[PDB]
Amino acid sequence: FYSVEIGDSTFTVLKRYQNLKPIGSGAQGIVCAAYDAILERNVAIKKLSRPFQNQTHAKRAYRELVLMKCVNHKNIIGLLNVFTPQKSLEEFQDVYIVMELMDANLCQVIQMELDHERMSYLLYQMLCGIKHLHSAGIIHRDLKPSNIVVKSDCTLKILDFGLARTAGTSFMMEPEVVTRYYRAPEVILGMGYKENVDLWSVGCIMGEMVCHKILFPGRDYIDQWNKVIEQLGTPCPEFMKKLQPTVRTYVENRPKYAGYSFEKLFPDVLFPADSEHNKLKASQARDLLSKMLVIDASKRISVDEALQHPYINVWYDPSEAEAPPPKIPDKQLDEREHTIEEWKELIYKEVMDLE
């Protein structure tokens, strides 16, 4: 393998990856669109900006790789390869990643004027993707337009697992990672999180696909809330009673908000021409949204219920919706952790195996 200069950190990729150029920044790493001559297909390469020079960011990647190995689905990115630019367990300090380069990220169609069927289908797919991880007890907690790529033929795939995992009893105290414009309430407020929080995102997404503007403009996590409750009425006392002790007071002390009717949040026009070809009509996407775009964490729809719902229903091909959920060994627990050194090794336990 060789190297090529980029931004600041230079690369150390294998020869089978020519004409190497950058494509996207990265909160956790970097990524180029080099051509895998040895396989024929320009591939996406990312090496991770934060290997394991800490404690809180190695655990993330480690969990991402393993999830990567045990994943597989037409709507979920698939690992093409993993290599290390080092020789012995000593010099180890960089793990690169290969993967099929798509045609662009949703953050592209976000700026396009879909027309149902298409959207109708992507949602379905996106929906399908999530569904996978869920059906095996897994949360993406980062579904956002940025991490959603297409392929010139309404084909879609979710990407990045750098932080995904499963839980039930956990906070965050570091939401300074899960991009807030699409951060869910159970997230924001240090509330517990089942595993549907993913859908929330998915909503803010649809919102982003029909309004063209983000949905809940954040100026600091603290103002996030303010901009959402401002658009969804102040949550019910049933919800309130749910929050931790402290967050409560603040949360109650808020300025009681009207909330809006989705007939008003998303008026007809914002929805693709009603070229009806079935159960596909304006009032449908909206109807769906109002089942997603919801604060209480328990009264918000779900994947299972999602797919099996009118604006999705149609192309519900079990061949890819009732997908055999992926499994894992027993190295995953999530709320636990190991040394800030052997973490490195368990990582090496990968790059070597996968080659």
Partner: peptide, 9 residues
């Protein structure tokens, strides 16, 4: 029905 096949990016 059908399924879309193209997506003009």
């Amino acid at each position: 029905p059908k399924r879309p096949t193209t997506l003009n990016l």
